[PDB]
Structure formats: C-alpha cells, structure tokens
Amino acid sequence: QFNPYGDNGGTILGIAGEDFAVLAGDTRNITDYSINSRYEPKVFDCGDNIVMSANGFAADGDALVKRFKNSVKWYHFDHNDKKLSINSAARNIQHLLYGKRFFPYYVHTII
Amino acid sequence: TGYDLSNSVFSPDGRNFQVEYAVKAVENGTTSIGIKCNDGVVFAVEKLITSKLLVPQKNVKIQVVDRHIGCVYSGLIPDGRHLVNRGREEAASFKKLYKTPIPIPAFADRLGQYVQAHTLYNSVRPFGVSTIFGGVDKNGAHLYMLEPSGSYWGYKGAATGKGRQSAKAELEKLVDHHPEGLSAREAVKQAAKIIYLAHEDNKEKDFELEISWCSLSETNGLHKFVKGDLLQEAIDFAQKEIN
Amino acid sequence: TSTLLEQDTSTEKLYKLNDKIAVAVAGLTADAEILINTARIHAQNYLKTYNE
Amino acid sequence: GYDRHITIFSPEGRLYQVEYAFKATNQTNINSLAVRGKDCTVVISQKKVPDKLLDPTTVSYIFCISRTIGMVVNGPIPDARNAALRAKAEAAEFRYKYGYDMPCDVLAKRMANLSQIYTQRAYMRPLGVILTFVSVDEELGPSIYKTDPAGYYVGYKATATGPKQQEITTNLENHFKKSKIDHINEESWEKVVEFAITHMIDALGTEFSKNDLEVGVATKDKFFTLSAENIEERLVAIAEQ
Amino acid sequence: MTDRYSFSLTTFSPSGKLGQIDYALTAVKQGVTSLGIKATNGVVIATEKKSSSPLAMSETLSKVSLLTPDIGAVYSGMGPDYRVLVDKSRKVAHTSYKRIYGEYPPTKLLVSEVAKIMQEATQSGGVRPFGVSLLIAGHDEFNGFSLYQVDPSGSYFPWKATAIGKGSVAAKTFLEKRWNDELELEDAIHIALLTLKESVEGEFNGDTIELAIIGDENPDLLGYTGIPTDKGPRFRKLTSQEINDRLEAL
Amino acid sequence: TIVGVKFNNGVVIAADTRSTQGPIVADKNCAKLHRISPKIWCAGAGTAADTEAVTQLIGSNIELHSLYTSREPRVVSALQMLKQHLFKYQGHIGAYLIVAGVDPTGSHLFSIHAHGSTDVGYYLSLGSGSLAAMAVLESHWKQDLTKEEAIKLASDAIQAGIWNDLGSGSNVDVCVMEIGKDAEYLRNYLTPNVREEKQKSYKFPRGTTAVLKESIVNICDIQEE
Amino acid sequence: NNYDGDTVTFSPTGRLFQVEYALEAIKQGSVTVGLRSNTHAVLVALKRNADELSSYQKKIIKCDEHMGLSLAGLAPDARVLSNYLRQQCNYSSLVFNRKLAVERAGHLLCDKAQKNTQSYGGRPYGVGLLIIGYDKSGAHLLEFQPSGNVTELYGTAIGARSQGAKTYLERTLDTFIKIDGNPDELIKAGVEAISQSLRDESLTVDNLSIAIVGKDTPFTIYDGEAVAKYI
Amino acid sequence: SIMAVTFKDGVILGADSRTTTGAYIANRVTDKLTRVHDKIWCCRSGSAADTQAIADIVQYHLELYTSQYGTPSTETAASVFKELCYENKDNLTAGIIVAGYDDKNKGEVYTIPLGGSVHKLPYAIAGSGSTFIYGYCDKNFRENMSKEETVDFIKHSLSQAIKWDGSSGGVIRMVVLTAAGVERLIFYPDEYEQL
Amino acid sequence: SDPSSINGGIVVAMTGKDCVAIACDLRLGSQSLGVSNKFEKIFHYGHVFLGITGLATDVTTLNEMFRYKTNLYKLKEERAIEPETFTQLVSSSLYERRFGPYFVGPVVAGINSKSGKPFIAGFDLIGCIDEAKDFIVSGTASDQLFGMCESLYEPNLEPEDLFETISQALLNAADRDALSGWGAVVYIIKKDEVVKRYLKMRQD
Amino acid sequence: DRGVSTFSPEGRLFQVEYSLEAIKLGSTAIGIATKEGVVLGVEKRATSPLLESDSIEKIVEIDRHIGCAMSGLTADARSMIEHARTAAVTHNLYYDEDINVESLTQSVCDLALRFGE
Numbered sequence A: 001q002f003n004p005y006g007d008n009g010g011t012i013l014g015i016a017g018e019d020f021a022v023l024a025g026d027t028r029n030i031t032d033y034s035i036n037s038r039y040e041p042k043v044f045d046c047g048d049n050i051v052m053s054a055n056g057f058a059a060d061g062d063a064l065v066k067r068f069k070n071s072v073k074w075y076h077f078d079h080n081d082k083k084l085s086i087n088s089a090a091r092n093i094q095h096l097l098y099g100k101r102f103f104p105y106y107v108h109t110i111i
Numbered sequence B: 001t002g003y004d005l006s007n008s009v010f011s012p013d014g015r016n017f018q019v020e021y022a023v024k025a026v027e028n029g030t031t032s033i034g035i036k037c038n039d040g041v042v043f044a045v046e047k048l049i050t051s052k053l054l055v056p057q058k059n060v061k062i063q064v065v066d067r068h069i070g071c072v073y074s075g076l077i078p079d080g081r082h083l084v085n086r087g088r089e090e091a092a093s094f095k096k097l098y099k100t101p102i103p104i105p106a107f108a109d110r111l112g113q114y115v116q117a118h119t120l121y122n123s124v125r126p127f128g129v130s131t132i133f134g135g136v137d138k139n140g141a142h143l144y145m146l147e148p149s150g151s152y153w154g155y156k157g158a159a160t161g162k163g164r165q166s167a168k169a170e171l172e173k174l175v176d177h178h179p180e181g182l183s184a185r186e187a188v189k190q191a192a193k194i195i196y197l198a199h200e201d202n203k204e205k206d207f208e209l210e211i212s213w214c215s216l217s218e219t220n221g222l223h224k225f226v227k228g229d230l231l232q233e234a235i236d237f238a239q240k241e242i243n
Numbered sequence C: 001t002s003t004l005l006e007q008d009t010s011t012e013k014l015y016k017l018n019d020k021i022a023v024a025v026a027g028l029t030a031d032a033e034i035l036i037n038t039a040r041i042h043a044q045n046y047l048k049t050y051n052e
Numbered sequence D: 001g002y003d004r005h006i007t008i009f010s011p012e013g014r015l016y017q018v019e020y021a022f023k024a025t026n027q028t029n030i031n032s033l034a035v036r037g038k039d040c041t042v043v044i045s046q047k048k049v050p051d052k053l054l055d056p057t058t059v060s061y062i063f064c065i066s067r068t069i070g071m072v073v074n075g076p077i078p079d080a081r082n083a084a085l086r087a088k089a090e091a092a093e094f095r096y097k098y099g100y101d102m103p104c105d106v107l108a109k110r111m112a113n114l115s116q117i118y119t120q121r122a123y124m125r126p127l128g129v130i131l132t133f134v135s136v137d138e139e140l141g142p143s144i145y146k147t148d149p150a151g152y153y154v155g156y157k158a159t160a161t162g163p164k165q166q167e168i169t170t171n172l173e174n175h176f177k178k179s180k181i182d183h184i185n186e187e188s189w190e191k192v193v194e195f196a197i198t199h200m201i202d203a204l205g206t207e208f209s210k211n212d213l214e215v216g217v218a219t220k221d222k223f224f225t226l227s228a229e230n231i232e233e234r235l236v237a238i239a240e241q
Numbered sequence E: 001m002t003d004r005y006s007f008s009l010t011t012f013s014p015s016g017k018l019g020q021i022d023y024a025l026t027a028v029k030q031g032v033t034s035l036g037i038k039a040t041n042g043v044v045i046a047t048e049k050k051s052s053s054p055l056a057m058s059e060t061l062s063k064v065s066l067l068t069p070d071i072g073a074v075y076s077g078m079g080p081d082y083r084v085l086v087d088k089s090r091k092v093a094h095t096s097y098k099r100i101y102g103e104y105p106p107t108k109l110l111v112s113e114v115a116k117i118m119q120e121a122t123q124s125g126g127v128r129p130f131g132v133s134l135l136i137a138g139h140d141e142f143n144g145f146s147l148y149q150v151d152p153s154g155s156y157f158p159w160k161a162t163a164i165g166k167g168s169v170a171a172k173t174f175l176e177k178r179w180n181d182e183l184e185l186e187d188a189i190h191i192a193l194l195t196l197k198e199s200v201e202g203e204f205n206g207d208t209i210e211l212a213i214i215g216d217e218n219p220d221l222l223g224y225t226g227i228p229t230d231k232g233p234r235f236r237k238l239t240s241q242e243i244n245d246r247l248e249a250l
Numbered sequence F: 001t002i003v004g005v006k007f008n009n010g011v012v013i014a015a016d017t018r019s020t021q022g023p024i025v026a027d028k029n030c031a032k033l034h035r036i037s038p039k040i041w042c043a044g045a046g047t048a049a050d051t052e053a054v055t056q057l058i059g060s061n062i063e064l065h066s067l068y069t070s071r072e073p074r075v076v077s078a079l080q081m082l083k084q085h086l087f088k089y090q091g092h093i094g095a096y097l098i099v100a101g102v103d104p105t106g107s108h109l110f111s112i113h114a115h116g117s118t119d120v121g122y123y124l125s126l127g128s129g130s131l132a133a134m135a136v137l138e139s140h141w142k143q144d145l146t147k148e149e150a151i152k153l154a155s156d157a158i159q160a161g162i163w164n165d166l167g168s169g170s171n172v173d174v175c176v177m178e179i180g181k182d183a184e185y186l187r188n189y190l191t192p193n194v195r196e197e198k199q200k201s202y203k204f205p206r207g208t209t210a211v212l213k214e215s216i217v218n219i220c221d222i223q224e225e
Numbered sequence G: 001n002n003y004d005g006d007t008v009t010f011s012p013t014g015r016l017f018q019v020e021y022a023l024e025a026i027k028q029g030s031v032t033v034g035l036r037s038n039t040h041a042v043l044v045a046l047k048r049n050a051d052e053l054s055s056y057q058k059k060i061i062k063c064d065e066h067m068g069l070s071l072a073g074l075a076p077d078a079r080v081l082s083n084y085l086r087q088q089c090n091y092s093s094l095v096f097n098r099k100l101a102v103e104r105a106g107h108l109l110c111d112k113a114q115k116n117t118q119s120y121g122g123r124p125y126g127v128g129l130l131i132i133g134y135d136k137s138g139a140h141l142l143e144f145q146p147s148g149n150v151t152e153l154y155g156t157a158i159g160a161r162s163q164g165a166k167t168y169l170e171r172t173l174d175t176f177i178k179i180d181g182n183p184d185e186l187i188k189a190g191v192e193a194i195s196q197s198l199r200d201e202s203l204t205v206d207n208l209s210i211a212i213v214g215k216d217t218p219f220t221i222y223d224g225e226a227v228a229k230y231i
Numbered sequence H: 001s002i003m004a005v006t007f008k009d010g011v012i013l014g015a016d017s018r019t020t021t022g023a024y025i026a027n028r029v030t031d032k033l034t035r036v037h038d039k040i041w042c043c044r045s046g047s048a049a050d051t052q053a054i055a056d057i058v059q060y061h062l063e064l065y066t067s068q069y070g071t072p073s074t075e076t077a078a079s080v081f082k083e084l085c086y087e088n089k090d091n092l093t094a095g096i097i098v099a100g101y102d103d104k105n106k107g108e109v110y111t112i113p114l115g116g117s118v119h120k121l122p123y124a125i126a127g128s129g130s131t132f133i134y135g136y137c138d139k140n141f142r143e144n145m146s147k148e149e150t151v152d153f154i155k156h157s158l159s160q161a162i163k164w165d166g167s168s169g170g171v172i173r174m175v176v177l178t179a180a181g182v183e184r185l186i187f188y189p190d191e192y193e194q195l
Numbered sequence I: 001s002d003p004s005s006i007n008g009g010i011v012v013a014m015t016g017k018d019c020v021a022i023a024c025d026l027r028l029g030s031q032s033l034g035v036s037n038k039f040e041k042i043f044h045y046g047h048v049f050l051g052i053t054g055l056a057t058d059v060t061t062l063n064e065m066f067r068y069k070t071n072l073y074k075l076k077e078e079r080a081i082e083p084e085t086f087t088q089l090v091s092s093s094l095y096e097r098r099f100g101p102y103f104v105g106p107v108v109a110g111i112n113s114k115s116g117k118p119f120i121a122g123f124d125l126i127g128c129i130d131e132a133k134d135f136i137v138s139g140t141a142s143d144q145l146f147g148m149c150e151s152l153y154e155p156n157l158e159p160e161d162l163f164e165t166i167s168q169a170l171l172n173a174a175d176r177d178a179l180s181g182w183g184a185v186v187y188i189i190k191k192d193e194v195v196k197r198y199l200k201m202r203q204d
Numbered sequence J: 001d002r003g004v005s006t007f008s009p010e011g012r013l014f015q016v017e018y019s020l021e022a023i024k025l026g027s028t029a030i031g032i033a034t035k036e037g038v039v040l041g042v043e044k045r046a047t048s049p050l051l052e053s054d055s056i057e058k059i060v061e062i063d064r065h066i067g068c069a070m071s072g073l074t075a076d077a078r079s080m081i082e083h084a085r086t087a088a089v090t091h092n093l094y095y096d097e098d099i100n101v102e103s104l105t106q107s108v109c110d111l112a113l114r115f116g117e
Ligand SMILES: [Cl-]
Pocket: D109, D110, D113, D114, E087
C-alpha cells in the first residue's frame, strides 16, 4: 500500500535563559540509511521574535511552519499589527496541529 | 412597451433591445482592427492618452489566448477581460482532452455560444464588447469578429469602435488592390496607417499605437507584440501617409 | 353536472383518508388531491411508527 | 402588461414571446427549400455576403449535425449555432446510449420538446429560429422534419422557410398536384438539386450565380454540402436546356 | 444564470380567479374539436387532422397517442404541450406503477398522475399551466371501460361521452340525444363519425380524421405467441381504409 | 444452461428450468427466458434476482424508447443499455445474459457478462452448463442452419447441460425469433425429467394432528349495521 | 431613469447607471494622492472625522510587504477588496514562492469588480483604490474604478477636489519622476500635491496619513507625530 | 497478442481472436480491433469490459469532435484514450494500442500501458503474448516496409505469440489503414501454424 | 454472525383443490437461548397471506412496510391487492435494497378473488421469485421442509386433507432443527373462509 | 419594485440610508471615554407603567473588557451581540488572550453589508 509518512531524522534543542532563549537543530536530512542533505535548515525565524522547528517527517514540518508563518501574517492584518506573544503563538500552533487530529502532522514542534 | 427593460425579452419586431443597447457601449469605445495576411493575422488598437500621468506602453489592451490566438476588443474593457478569461478556460479544456491547440473556428464558436448564453436569461446582462480575434492553426490563417448578440463571421479585414466606418473603408481598398494577398510586414505598416486615419474620430486627445501579429513565417505561428524598431518603422510609415 | 357524466365511477367531493377518517372538499379538486395523498401518507407513517 | 414579456398566457390564450420569436426567424432575409428524391434529400438556401471584408467561406446557415443528418436554419446566427451545438451533442449522446444513429424525425422531436420547455418555463427565452432536419433514414427513407419556436414539428414531402416561403410552397404544391407522387422521380441527386434550384428560380423570379446559393445533400449513410464549383456545374446544366 | 423565478406565476386575483388557468382554458377553446364515446363493449376517441400545409405529411403527426396497451389519449389546444405530456404520462405509468406492481396502471390512476403533473405547473415556481385538455380512454380488469377528461387546472371527471375544443358545446348536445347504456362499439363509432362531421369544414375522409378504439384484445398486434394470459393490446388506431368503409354506411 | 443459435431467417435461444440455493434445488420449473420486448428476448444466468431486475428495467426503458421514436426496438439498443448499467456496478450486479432478437436491421445474437462486456456469435452458451452445451455446439454447428435444425441443436445443447451439469436440470424452454414473423415462446418444449409414481399414498387419516386451539380469521372489512 | 433599477440593465445609449452611481460614492469620499519615482512609490491620504470627539477614518490598508492601497468611498467595500488582494498576494507567495506583480493585482481586482456588473441580485463596489507597490519591474502606481477599469500611472488622485492635485502632478511629472533615492523629497512632493485639493481645513497631525514602498523599504504607514515632520 | 505497425502506405493493426476466463476460452472468434473513427482504430488488451467501455466513450467523443471541428488527428484520439485511462487508473485494467492514417501525418501508432502513459512508436506490441515476440519483432522490423512485407511481419509475429501463449489463439485478424481505404484480412490456423 | 439464522424459524405453503395452506413455527431466539414462543411469522393484507423467516427485526420491519404499501394501494385502487400483484411488490421492494438487503425469506399464499385460482410464491432476500405449482419452503429447516413436502405432497388435496399434510410437513421438519419449534400455526384458506389452528408439539 | 442592494444617484445605498432613519427613532444611548474608564448610559423608555422596567436590557456585556449599548430596532441587535460574544470567546480560544476592542468592532461591522437577493 502507499504510506503517507516518512522519517527525515535530525534533532532539535530549545533552552530558555533569564533574558534570552535558544532553538538549535542539526542541518542533516536523511531517509533510511542515505543522506539527503548535510545543510537543510530546520529552525526558522517566524517574525515577532519567534523561532520555530517542527522535527520528524520533513514534509509535515515544512507545511506546519508555512501555516504558522501565514498565521503570524494574518494576525498583523486582523489586529492592527499587534505583536504576537509567545503564549498566543503556542495556543495558535495547538489549533493548527489539532486540525489534522485524524491525519496528524508526524512532527515534534518547539518554539 | 417595456420590452427593452429586461434582457432575453422579444420585442413585437422579434428584437432583443438590451443586446442593441450593448452595441451602443461598443460604438462608444476606442477603434480596434484586424487584418488577415498571406500566412497570418495582424491586430491593432487605439489607446487614448487621457493625461500625461499615464505611463507610456504600460496599459496593454491586446490579450493572448493559449500561445497562437490574439484578442482585441472595443467597449467596456472589463467585459472584454471577462470574455478572454472564459476563452482561456475553453482553450485549456480543449487542449487537455484533444491535445492539439484549439483551432480558430472551434475557439470562435466557444466565445460565440458563451456570449449568446448571456442573451437567454434576464438574470444576466449582454456583453458590452465587440471582439476581433484570430491566429494560425493547421488549416492556415483565420480572422473573426464577435458581436454582443453572439454573432460572428470570418473576415478578410475587421474593425469596431468609434472609428469603424473610416477603418472599414481603408480595409475595403486593400482587399480590392491586393487580390493575390498581403504580406505580414506590409499588414503591420497598413494596420498602423488605418489606426492613425481612424484617430480623426478621436482627434481631441492624442493616442498611443499598439500592434500584435501571428505569422507562420515571421513569428512561427505564435502571437507576439510589435516592439522597438519594427513599431517605430510602422509609426514613421503611418505619420508619412497622413502628411 | 351533465346527463353524460358517469356518476357511479365519479368522485370530486368525498375522499377516504383511512378507515376511520374521511374529508369533504370545497375548491380546486386537483389542489385537494395533492393534499389528500400527503394526508394518506402521514396516517400510514403514524400507524407504522406507533402501531395505532 | 407583463404577459407580453415572459411566456405566460394572455387573456386570449396566446404566448406573445413565442409569436415574436417567429418574427426574429425572418431577420436574416434568407429563403430555404427542401425536397426528396428516390434515393436522396436535397436542401438549398440563399447565401448573401453584403460586406467585401467578410470571408465568404465562413458565412453559412447549413450544419452537418451527424454523418447522416443535415440541418438548415432560418433565423439569426447566434441562436442557429446554439441549436446546432445542442443537436450535435444530442445526436452523439443518442448513438452512445442506444447504439444506433439518431433518426432525423427523433432528433426533430427532441429539439421540439426542448423548444416547448422555453414556452412553459419563464427564465428561458425561445430561440428565434426554424430548424429543417434532412436525412435518408434507414427505416423511413428520404426524410424532411421541421421545428419552430412553439415546439411544433411535422414531416414533409417538401417544404420552404423564410420571407417568401408561401411563393415557394405554392410552386412545389402545384408540381406534386401534377405528378401525383410524394417525391422527385429522379435517379441521381445532381438532377434533384437541378430541380430544387430551377423551382426556386421560378418561385422567386431571380437568377443565381455560384456564390448566391448554398446546397446540402443527404444520401444513404452521409450528408454533405456542395462547393461553389459543384454549384457552378449544376447552374451550367440548367442553362443548357 | 440560475432559474431566479422561484415564485408562482399563477396567483389568485381579488375575484378569486386563477388568471393563468382561465387563459389556458381559453387556448383549449381555440383548439380543434376532439370527442370520446363509451359503449358497453368498448370506448372510441376521435379528432380532426388539421394539416398546417398540404406539403406536410399529416401521418407523421399523431394526435391520438397510446399511453399503455389498454389506454389511449387525444387532446384539444397546444400540440407541443400535449406531446411532452404524453412522454411524461408514458414514463410515470412505468416509474410510479409498472416497476412496482408488474402490471399497467388502471385508467383512473394514470389519469390521476397526469392530473398531478398539470396541477404542479399551476402552483410551482417560474412555469405557466399546460394549454391542453386531454380525453383519456382505457380498460382495466376491475373497473372495465372508462373515459376521463383532464383540464389545465389538474381537475378530471369521468364521462359516458363528451367533446372539448372548437365546437364542444354543439357536439355535447348531439351526443346527449344519441347516447344510451345499450350501445355496441360499432354504434359508438358511427355516432362519433356523425358528431365529428359537424365541426369539420373541408375534406372528411380517413386521411383527414384520426380515430382509435379501446375494445377487444388484439392477439394479432401482441408480436409474440406462447403465453395464454397475454392476449394483446385493447388500444387500436383505425386505418385510413377502415374509416372510409364506415363512411359509406353513414 | 442457456444457449443462443443463429439460423438462416432468425435466432433461437433455449434454457434449462432449475434454480439452486447451494446444493438444494429451489425451483424445479424456473423461467430463465425473459421478454425484453415483443421480438427481443434474453436468457439469464448468475444471481436470479439480478437477471430478472436488469431485464425488467431495460425492457421498461426499451418500451419508452420504442414509443418515443415510433420504431420497433433494436437488439443493439437493449445490448448497449444492459452493458452500460452492468459496467456502472463493476460486476456487483451478477447478471450474465444471452440477448437475441429480430428487428428492422435483421437477426442478432449477443452475450453479456456481468462486468459489462459483450460479444457477437452464431452460437453462444452461458452458466455452469456452458461447457457441456458448448461441447455439443462445437460438434454439430454449421453455417446455413434451417429453423428445424437450429431448434434441434439448441435443445440438444441444453440436454447436455441438464444431464452432465448438477446446476442445470428439469425441462427445456425454447424461444424462436424468425425475421418477419411473431416470436414463438415454447415453454416446456421437452419434459425429459418427469417424476415416477410413489410406492405409497402419505395422505393421513383426519384427526391425526393434535390441535391446541381453533378460530375463524376475519378477512372481511368492518361490516354495516 | 427606467434603466437604473439594477446592474443587469443597459440604457438606450449603452450606459450602466448602477455602475455610474457607484462611481459617484468615490467623488463624495475624502481626497487621496498617489505618485512614484523609479526607486519609491508614495500614497498621501486626507483622513475625515465625524466631529471633534470622533477619530479620523483610516484610508490606507497594507496588502503585503511590497504592496498596499488607499481608499475613497465605501470603507467596507475597500475592506472586502483589500482582503481579496491580501489573499491573492498570499496565494502567490505560498504556492509559487513569488511576490504578486502589481500589474497582475490590477487584472485580478478588475475581474472581481466586473462579475458584480453583469449578474442580477448583486451590486457594484462603491469604492476607488490607489494601489502602490515595488516588484521585479520597479515602482508601480495603479488606479482602480469599480466599473472594473484599472490604469497604471506615474501619479494620480481620487475623491472630492482630486482634480487640483491631479493638475499639479501633470506639471511636476518631469521633476518628481527623477526623485530617486530620496524618500523625504518624494513625500514632500506628495504633501505639496494633496495641498492643492484642500479648502478651509489644513493638514494637522491627526489629519494627514502617508504610506511609502521602495527598493529597500517595506510598505509602512505613518500617522500621528510621525507626519509632523512634513506639516 | 495485439500489434500496430506503421509502413510506407499507412498502418496495419493485428490481433488474435481469443478471450479467456481462467483457462476456459469464453470466445475463440473475438474481434479485438475496434473502430473509434473511419481511419482511427485501436487494439484492445486487458479487461474485455474495461476496453469495450473505454472504446465506446472514445467513439462518442470523436463523433462529437467530428460534428464540430472535422476529422480528428490520431494524436487527438490517443489523448482521449490517455485521459480516460490516467484519470481512472485506480479502477481500470486496460492496455490499448491506437493506430490511424492521416494524409498529412500518414501512418501513426500510439501505445497506452496500464498507468495511462502515452508513447508514440514506429510500431507497438501489447498483450500477454507480446512478451514472447519482443526479441523477434526488434530484429525483423524495418521502417517504410511495403504492404505485403508488413502483413508478413505481423502474420509471423502473432503466429509466434499464439504458439507460446495459452491466452492467445484462434484466427489472426488484421485491419489495413491507407489512403485507398480500410481492408479487413483474416488468416486461419492451417495457414499461420505451418510458417 | 450469519443474520438469517440468529433468531431462527420456518414457513411452508401448499396448494390444494380450490384452496391454499400456509404454516409457521412460533419460536424467536438469540441463537441457543429461546426468548419468545408467541412470535407468529404469517401476516395477512386482506385475502393475501405473507410468511417471513430470517432476522426478526426485518420480519417486523417488512410486515409494517407491506401493511403501509397495501393500505395506500387499497385507497388508490379501491380494491384489495391480489396474490400475483403483491408477489411483484415484494420482489420490487427487496431488490431496491440490493447492496444492503433485508435478511429474510418471504412466502406469499392466497386465492385470486376473480379467477379463484390457488397461488403460492417464494423469494430470496434480494427478491428473486420462485412460483411453484406444488409447495414453497423458507427458514433454518428449509432442507428438512423440502424433504417432507417432496414425499408427503400430492396434487388436488381437499382442504381437511391438505391440513394434515402441511401440519405433518412442518412438525416433523421443526423437530430436526434446533432453532425451530416452540409451537406452530396453520392457516387453511378457501375463497371466502379462513380457519387458523395452533398445533400441539414438543417444547424442546 | 427595485434591488435591495441598489445605489441612489448620489452614490448611497437606499436600504442603509433608510435603516439610519429607524435608528433616529430609537431611545437615546450615550458613551464617554476617560483615562479612568468608559461610561455607557441609556434611556429605557417603557411603553406603559405595568411594564417591569428592569427587564428592558439595552446595555449588554460582550466580554469582561467590552460593554455594548444599543439604539433602534433592539431585536435586530440580539444576533449582533451573539456574533460579538462568539468572536470575543473564539479569539480567546485561538490565541489565549483578550481580543482588541477595534478587532471586535471590525468583526461586528463585517455582518452589516451581508444583505441582498
Ligand atoms: Cl424529450
């Protein structure tokens, strides 16, 4: 049969300081035992001082990051360029993920 | 009376007055022409320069359908754009099923049936444009003109808009003086002249000339705009003929 | 009526809705027959649902 | 007086939009004629190209509906082409569903039923056209069936349509009163076309060049139209006797 | 586009008249005369073949239509409206009855269905009533021979004999004098021809008259043998010659 | 076992009269010969409900088509309408039919498989007994058969099915469709399997069965007075 | 007269009155100016208050990082059309990774407006838009009319007394087109242009609304003490 | 076993006459060569029902095409087959060879495998029996052969395909498509078995 | 698991000289467990009798459905439906659930009120018609009923004789089926009288 | 008659201009904004002394941070209040915060011109 999921490997790490935060990831993209790329970024600037990574199936991670980036754009449009707070971004992403509850995004998300 | 208040109503004459009113919108528009040459077709249009603030060569009027069909129209410009959008859907669906690019006669009837459909119901308004279109297919060159009623025929030459009577007279001379036929390069020069001659009906404001052509020899049977040196050569020829 | 109207097979006024309910009609006969058939169906829907 | 705008009854029990649609039929000022031979059905129509800028080859009111069925239209070209496309579609769909070529009289009935609906439903207007369907049917032989904006249709031994239809009708009536047969007793379709053109010349009192006429012929298993040069050969034969 | 006429085009006027139904009945009045007579052993329906042109082949236009093997229909009014009603009537006999019960509907129930289609064109959005009155003759095992009239309103009535269209008022008076409950089918055909002659102007022969009967079963018209219970249609259209034979004994 | 055999001036179809649920004989005198139209008949094999339903639906639509066109129905029409219906349902309507008939075009013999496929032949057979029937047809069929010869060949091919096939049995039903004639339906043309007299009458003496209760059943409507 | 009941009806001279009435709503609207050089494109808008207690109605709407418009007429209709542009700009970015060309944004507004002029039951849009943008062929200014007509211009103005600003720009054409790599001077020319459309009232701190887009300048709106510099 | 070969004067379509359910021959005189237009024919392999259903729709589509736009190209016929086969790939088991004669393009052959892909080829083979003659056909095919040469090439080719394939058998049907018109050829077992 | 043998039960119909007989058992069960011995499987719409075996929810549903349809028939036709016509209505109604069928084995019995001709018919779950001259069987003991009927039956039996034959056919067939019995009813049907008898039988 | 979405020759929507007349007939409502808060006041205008005035609800809560006063055909306001409350709560569900007063107002005003045939 056709399997809609894949594993592109990689690892992401988020640490929160007193007045700073870091989001890190390896730049390696794999399938099975082959290397797809040694430098394909997995951590993105999404605007409003928010960095996001969706790690797992690369297709689902790319799609989710796009939808959140789009989500930030429409927040500005509909709310007079209000800065999106990290707690608001987190709640928005929950609704993005839960939308595909019965066909999930096979990713682990850190912002 | 009241027969002219609703579209699709027959008058005691057997006329659709709403369609005849649409023709008035067309007669109000700028002059547009088409010339059928030895191995293709030429299209030309009059663009009125309302103000100095208009960016020259930017507000393009002639529209391509697929890659082989040119379309120009006089009247409500938006109504023309709507018709070309439908033409592009029809040409896309034809090519999708039958592979070959839509023949010109086949494309003519697709616009024809769509425009005619906007005369069957009073829920819609007839098209406020006459459309001159054509190009090269497997059976050679074809020039068509389509009216708000859905009426269309093939033409040796075609004209519509405010300067149509002037244009038609100049086209009729070319048909008589060239029975063997006209070359594509000659038809570009002649197209320029006819628009300049037909500008006497819109002489208040100065204008900008815009020409396009599809020729088997000159453009490989694709629709292209006349630009740079060849456009200036046609403007020079036109300017020489009015003086 | 007319002398050439077949009366014994004729019905324009009195209609059976079920074994317990009948209607007398006054107005457009055609319009009545549309409503009579609807009523006949409701009566049989009720009987099917409740067995009464 | 909105009973004259849409297809509802007038107090006289008339549909005025249908009557006005019949008037649109003559807007083109073109006359058509249809006759039957032993083996063929011929249809001739006047061809008028008033503009020198027109491509005369594209100016036609005769349509090849299927391989067997031809249709000449009396009315404006938009409505003619609307009816042509629909008949072409209906003929193709019939063959697919029922596995044999749609008969001429059955297509006539179908297009007449579609016409009837436009006379009963308000949102749709009648088409301002009279459709004359011709074929050599495999069961009924040479066949002429004609439709109008009322949704009426009937078969014909011969028929005529357009401004001067009554003049052509009486001319044909008089011929069939002599011969006492329902057709032209002639072997070749060439001579049946010569009869059709001759009796139109006599009825309209006008002479025709090769570019003035438009001819459609139905034989067993094909309907075709003649070229200018095919008509010229027909005109030469008429003049030489 | 879309049909934006979702409202009734037939409404009540302050006087309680439905205009469009009255105007439809006016269209029927202008129509050519048709009649029906019921005998003890059959029913006859008849009308004039008013040929629009002599070049026209009047045989190709059928005014008297088979609806089922045992039910025939004739009309007065708008021909196109009749032709589409015959198509819908033939289809509803199958969809609403024969495909359920495995037999053709009795006369009164097929009439009831035709009546319903006509009532709906009297109330439904963006349509005018049908401009015809139908006479429907039929036989069925339990009701025997019957004759019904259906009007643009959708109303229907059973008749011993009646007439509709141009000369109906005169025709109905003629039928009232001649009709008794002891008529044989041949007697009813003779009376039908006598009555119809009064409303016809021009030629009166088998080629200008359209006549059909509901009578005995015709095994010769069934098209197959072997099943005893299938004895063939009771509807028969009389030929040109068969009409002319009975015009000599007229 | 259903067969169709083309002949000089027509076509003949025949069938056996047995319907089976598992190994049990449900009906000893089934009718597998169906009237689509007066001169168009077909024989059905497969799901008994499916073949009856599909012939009745197409027979109905063919009758409406005939009335609409004013023409006698054609076999190619019934054929086309049957195959497009069966194809739609992707073989889930298990109707396997041999469609024969005479029309103004001439005599025709087709077969239709439940997935929506059709084929043309001078002789055809279908069902569990088709191989027994086809064996006889392939042995005795020639070009230019007479009517008498074609009936003989058709019934012999069914007999082969009755005798050698467990799914076929009882009697032979035939239908002859000759050009310019009425189709003759010969129900129980042969009766090769008639049960013999039993050894004993199993008629019981009256009062043999123990009855708890008796009562009159009211089948009449509510009475007057 | 008898032919203005709905948008589906042509007049005997081939005019669409419902469209012409929609065009009138724009003329009643407050003035807005548009002008561009080769490097930058500027919108200047005079905002209108209800009374002294009330705010000044916002005129300029951002459509993307590289595109936005100013409105004159029915504000709700500008909201519907600007939302549609936002979506079309957004579709181009997501599907094709391509910033929507200003010319193609015009073509899309035109076709959306047209459908409302040929169908029963609907009405024309009652607003006029000045679209500025910087794309792959440089700075652009468009004028939208709810007839469907969209025009590319060096400069223009719409709303009440717009003719004053339009004449000034027609004189200054050769000057302001050459203002390359100087945003402040191009805005000065825009503020001097809209000034030709003022009567009685003058440009105050909560009255004036300016927007700019250019080579290395995202579409940004200036209101309040941010435009005090240009008064 | 079905093949289409383009030669000097046009194209020839060849096929065997066998239809099977498992190992039982349902029909031994099958016509697998079917007309979608006067000079556009197809070769049907795979499901009998699927190919018949598709062929019927294409004949309908080309009859309607002809009504409106005149005689369709072989390329156009191939495109309509592809469209039906590609868009309904999940529910169809059909392998079709499309062969036609134009006067402009002369003989043309298009093959449509299961996927619904299209391949224009000088000649094509398909069906279960085709696998056994890949080696033979590749070695013996020349371009611009005569009519007699091309009939021999197909007769010899399908002769081998029938010999080795249980699913192929019966008579060899052929259809010649040239300017001259449409010719039907039949070759019986006694003829082609002794080759 | 098999819907047509969850609840169990049987019906048998026979023809005689100017009469018909239809009979059924009274058991309803959940497989092995017997729930009710009052579950009659024979219903009548005028003078037309219908027996239904199979899934009991469908037996009840189809009874309610055919009562509904025959009531509307009688109001429109102005006469009781006949056996031949009802047979076609059962068939029609079953085949419209072709791909989601009622799990039932219906049996029609009755005398045509006009012709006086005795009539019986049987159906499969999708509505195929078996129109036998002699007898029809249905249910979990159909094999047993086919055996009993095929040996016991002779044509043109008088009503009081036909009663004994059909009674002995049902009783002896039911006693060889685990999911049949718990009482039995027999209807003897003449042109204008119908007698209903409950049979004494083993209750295991 | 004439379209519901019809423009007047002055370029104003007839039905909108007419609704503004209905609002002029409504009971008075006043709002004053300060740096210490925003006050909302209404005239109740009971039609009779038997009408229990406390049941007259022309000041309505949308969320904890947004109040609303109405004037005109007050029955028409019920579905607008319903939409406003739904918008305020829905935004809090999607973003875990209080919605801006301007955004809530903009949401209510998007219903306004959703009328036609
Ligand atoms: Cl129809």
